[PDB]
Write a protein that binds this ligand. Sequence first.
Ligand SMILES: CCN(CC)CCC[C@H](C)Nc1ccnc2cc(Cl)ccc12
Length: 162
Amino acid sequence: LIVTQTMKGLDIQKVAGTWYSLAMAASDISLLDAQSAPLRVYVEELKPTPEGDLEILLQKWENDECAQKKIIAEKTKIPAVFKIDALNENKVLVLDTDYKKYLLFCMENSAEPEQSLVCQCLVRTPEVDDEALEKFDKALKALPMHIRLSFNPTQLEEQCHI
Ligand SMILES: CCN(CC)CCC[C@H](C)Nc1ccnc2cc(Cl)ccc12
């Protein structure tokens, strides 16, 4: 109930494949600040599953290392919102993609918006897409984002973005 966009027409099985965490943004700063901040996470691939769910694969800096985590995201009635497991009843919100170049999704927590919402601009290939960043950047004024991070193709090709 803060993210007012969500895409009508989501063919999930078309989001499959790899992506790079190019850009990402959040509501308060403590959440992404340092490499080891909680929602500092790097999406590496989308396996849409047969049930219609989506397995998410992502690296994250924690105990000194770049650590994989598998996150599975369960269907809901809305095609574009999926519920994730961990520490509250969750949403992954998919905002916009063309399937083939970029993909915009946020990640909130129904218990605590202005403190949980984190958003990401994903891309299919390790290069900056201005127009994706365009579309990312223009979708988060309706949102109270307070930190923005951008990464460059080299950091995209490395573990945990350096
Ligand atoms: C905004 C997402 N939402 C739950 C998925 C926030 C509630 C807290 C739980 C720990 N969220 C998480 C679920 C799964 N992995 C996580 C890795 C990190 Cl650093 C932080 C939160 C995570």
